Symmetry: C2
Subunit: 145 residues, 2 copies
Amino acid sequence: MMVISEKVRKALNDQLNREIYSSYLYLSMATYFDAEGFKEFAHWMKKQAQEELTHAMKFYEYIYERGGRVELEAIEKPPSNWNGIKDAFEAALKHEEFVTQSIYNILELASEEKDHATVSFLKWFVDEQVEEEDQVREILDLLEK
Amino acid sequence: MVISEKVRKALNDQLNREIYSSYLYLSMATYFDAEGFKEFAHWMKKQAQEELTHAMKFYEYIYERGGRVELEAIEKPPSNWNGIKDAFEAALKHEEFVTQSIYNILELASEEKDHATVSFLKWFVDEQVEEEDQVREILDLLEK
Ligand SMILES: [Fe+3]
Ligand SMILES: [Fe+3]
Ligand SMILES: [Fe+3]
Ligand SMILES: [Fe+3]
Ligand SMILES: [Zn+2]
Ligand SMILES: [Zn+2]
Ligand SMILES: [Zn+2]
Ligand SMILES: [Zn+2]
Ligand SMILES: [Zn+2]
């Protein structure tokens, strides 16, 4: 029996697929960095790509622990190229801000439905999102030289 | 109280460990600030803040399970290191000890089939893995 709403399941399935695309996007940044010779920037991107896949599997597991099912969707082709380093890290920041808004939106939905388990789940992700935007913002400040 | 007293003592002990961690990172900010590395100092400040929210997550979980928190004395952190690398190496050694301490609480709660504590702790095991790897990445970039 599923003890989440079909609309919170759908929302969480949508976020799982965003984390996979996030993963793919950061892998694509590594292909750029690696081609332009920045092997340490590529290495971070590959770490990030792995970590976004662990985010997606926590949603995967949560959905199944509450009796839902996961359906995987097509993943769009990510950009392969940026107009230099700053451009690449700004795209990353902009994508993380979009990811955060998307989780905040699910957090509003699950509150209106008084789903306390899902609320508790997403608060861990909010905190990680605040950390990840500030990591990228910090990179961007250091690049300003 | 719906946690065992052993798990309660272990989580209260980790809480005081996270408080000391915060204090340690703040002390690293005083070294970096004194030596003119303003950006390392800022990172250490944000980490001290973060460690405090780690501490307060253990706080709130202990009370949600019916326990009480008890604050212990906080030891005087070092305030000086041999150089930049020596400082981040102490940060790594310290995050490794925090990871082992947390893993041991995880082992204990799994023996006692305390699934809420296991679930609570797994967030921190993943955060400790990421933070250890952050220190490691900074160290490798220094060797350049
Ligand atoms: Fe993510
Ligand atoms: Fe992310
Ligand atoms: Fe911590
Ligand atoms: Fe830590
Ligand atoms: Zn590296
Ligand atoms: Zn994190
Ligand atoms: Zn992260
Ligand atoms: Zn800074
Ligand atoms: Zn952290």
